[PDB]
């Protein structure tokens, strides 16, 4: 908590000017079209447009903490709506243009967005998910599980067990869930396009996964307002708001960003939906 390295916090924001931004979002378009296996990696930056502050941005939790100030939340976790970005990733999965989604976010919004859990690795866990210590059954709740650091919640497993239910929020010392990390790693290795959205890429091994795609000749796209640990290993860096980038991209892709019907949980990815015919690229 005190000994914890919170990495580089408060680094200046970069804003690509409009014409560099329009060109970079078309190139990202081209790369989605060109790619067989696309993995998205998300961090706290995709939730700030929902009122949830990030960790290391100008008003990040750790950033403000360093300057003796407090993060501000403009919502509760329960009343937080998924962003245009969140709902773009749902539609990209539904049309078969997103193979796997890796998130370091505990804010619960990917799942609440209707995003299929069998295509999602939540590397730092989920505020709404408790897990039985025995059968390992996960309960996705409507309100945040009131503990952090993998403690007893109070409730017991109800599988046809009475096992002690614990939060999925990793403490500083707790290693990542093996299943989620294993699937996030395999997806990242096999990807030919890893795209990062609103992460500074500073936490091992979460931040390193997008680099594995680069091995084997995979392309790496970083989308982030601030520099990030692996900017140098990126084939494309887009310095702008992810909502704006993802709305331009979906628009280039011929895709609608679907309505969020409110909190819904989808265990398994449904069969893929029609998508637009691809442009002639080369
Ligand atoms: N609307 C936006 N559009 C684009 N980028 C944004 C936006 N808002 C913020 N950013 C950028 O988004 C980036 C967010 O980076 P960080 O704040 O480190 O969050 P993490 O997900 O990487 O933190 C990882 C873990 O570390 C913690 O200890 C917890 O365990 C976390 O799970 C910044 O560079 C912002 O400039
Ligand atoms: O508990 C917290 C503090 C910051 C917020 C987030 O997901 O960014 N989660
Ligand atoms: Zn159980």
UniProtKB/Swiss-Prot annotation:
Domain of life of the native organism: Eukaryota
Result for mutant: residue 16 to N: Found in non-small cell lung cancer; somatic mutation; reduced localization to chromatin; reduced histone deacetylase activity; does not affect the protein-lysine demyristoylase activity
Secretion signal span: none
Any one of the GO BP annotations: negative regulation of glycolytic process
N6-acetyllysine modification, residue list: 24
Annotated catalytic residues: 124
Cellular component, GO, one term: nucleoplasm
UniProt keyword Transport, yes or no: no
Annotated effect of mutating residue 47 to Y: Abolished NAD-dependent protein deacetylase, defatty-acylase and mono-ADP-ribosyltransferase activities
Disulfide bridges in this chain: none
Effect of mutating residue 80 to S: Found in non-small cell lung cancer; somatic mutation; reduced histone deacetylase activity; does not affect the protein-lysine demyristoylase activity
Cited function: NAD-dependent protein deacetylase, deacylase and mono-ADP-ribosyltransferase that plays an essential role in DNA damage repair, telomere maintenance, metabolic homeostasis, inflammation, tumorigenesis and aging. Displays protein-lysine deacetylase or defatty-acylase (demyristoylase and depalmitoylase) activity, depending on the context. Acts as a key histone deacetylase by catalyzing deacetylation of histone H3 at 'Lys-9', 'Lys-18' and 'Lys-56' (H3K9ac, H3K18ac and H3K56ac, respectively), suppressing target gene expression of several transcription factors, including NF-kappa-B.
Name of the protein in its database record: NAD-dependent protein deacylase sirtuin-6
